[PDB]
Amino acid sequence: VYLDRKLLTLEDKELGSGNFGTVKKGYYQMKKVVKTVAVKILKPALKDELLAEANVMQQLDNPYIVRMIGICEAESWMLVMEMAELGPLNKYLQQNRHVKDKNIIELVHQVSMGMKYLEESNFVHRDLAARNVLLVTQHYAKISDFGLSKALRADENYYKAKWPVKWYAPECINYYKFSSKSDVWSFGVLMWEAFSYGQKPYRGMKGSEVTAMLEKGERMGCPAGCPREMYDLMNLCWTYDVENRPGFAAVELRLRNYYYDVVNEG
Amino acid sequence: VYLDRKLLTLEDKELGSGNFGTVKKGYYQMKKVVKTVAVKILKPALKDELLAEANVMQQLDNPYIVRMIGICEAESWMLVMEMAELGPLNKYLQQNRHVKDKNIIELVHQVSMGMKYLEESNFVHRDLAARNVLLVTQHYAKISDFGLSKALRADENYYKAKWPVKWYAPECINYYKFSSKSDVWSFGVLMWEAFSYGQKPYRGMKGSEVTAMLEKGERMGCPAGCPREMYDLMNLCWTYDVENRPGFAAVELRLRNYYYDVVN
Ligand SMILES: Cc1n[nH]c2cc(Nc3nc(NC4CC4)c4occc4n3)ccc12
């Protein structure tokens, strides 16, 4: 997967930014056509981190997960990925509030599908948020940003450790253990964010304030006009006890079963 | 607006046809000379359908837009326009592969100027394609077939709905929202055809196949010998998100500057 710089064509304008560098829009002269590509460009460990993300990606093959097109060594380092034409879900739901509840369920259910694959493949996302969910169409979501993501060992159930504490489960805070159940906590916080329309979780609260709230059995409320059955599920995602918290299999099922009704019985 | 049939002389051979009727070539006793005219002749609602086309035309005065001379209520209804001596760009370019890159740029830049006028006047062409661009000279093009064109209200940015999918933008296919931004998508499809020398876009594919190809982030490739910068510009037109897509002012500004350099 070492792409040819002659085929790649960049848009001299960014759609991303970060410690890594800039993410510019591009066009890659594919098999017979031209595929629009998102391209992470390195401005060290930044090259090891980008080779990590490139490895976590090359393995994962799922519709609801950003597919990678390949690496491209040229004037700089290029991580070539399948472009999500509409952008990050938090910034998209802020701008478009006419996005009906049904459209929102369909999108979070697509995240629960991609996450269920990540679970089955033995991968921890570790940064699963509204920001890191990008849109192909208004009705097609892909899970992005695999920089904190970790491939698990065959005999291992969890990983043991920058600090997205608002998306983090209590065992990540307290004991640094991350598993697919910790991503189920993040998914809860992500599900909240969408129904809120990109409103930031635990608005104004500091990291320890969030930790203290969750230890008191306190949770974020039901965003305005969110279907009760979705808030029901958020709190289920938000179970303090890791052993009793559902897996993505059971979460995606609850989203699938709800959606199946919603479209037909509504 | 109401032409004397005493001044209108019609030929036998047609320049086109449709459900509307025939497009006979004609001559019109004008000022002190004779103007060559293209005449749309009805074969019901089609009358108020062709009156809609005559109305869009009456309002538009720009060199790169097929001027209307007037109407004629004689044998059958006649819509009298200014003759495009060489005809449709696709057929012209299919039948002329000697036409150089500098020549095609100049013609698509001319389409882009007439389109910048139309955008500024708050009209949506809705049928922009190589076939609806007619050549007056191998160096003077005109936007025609204002059949699908609509005139937006002073407060609306778009229009909400024959259906040339292969030219339509995704927001049109999905939600039926035509605007000058949707005409930029079609403009990009026009720009492709012209460098393809009249080759039909997305050959063999059905409407849904095209739609699926677009959502997959795939676009038509670079036609053979097409200046890279003109291919870079098609992809700009071919922006999925309408908000991030260039307008006609932005499209003309890129063609004007390229051509400014290319000729000089
Ligand atoms: C309006 C707007 N802002 N940003 C955008 C980013 C995109 N598309 C996109 N962006 C990536 N990286 C960027 C940091 C997000 C991607 O990475 C993998 C796929 C992918 N697709 C589209 C629109 C916007």
Ligand SMILES: Cc1n[nH]c2cc(Nc3nc(NC4CC4)c4occc4n3)ccc12
């Ligand atoms: C060789 C050849 N074939 N067709 C031609 C059409 C023209 N000129 C023309 N044609 C119109 N309508 C035609 C259906 C396209 C026009 O409508 C308004 C103006 C106008 N000027 C010239 C040559 C040819």
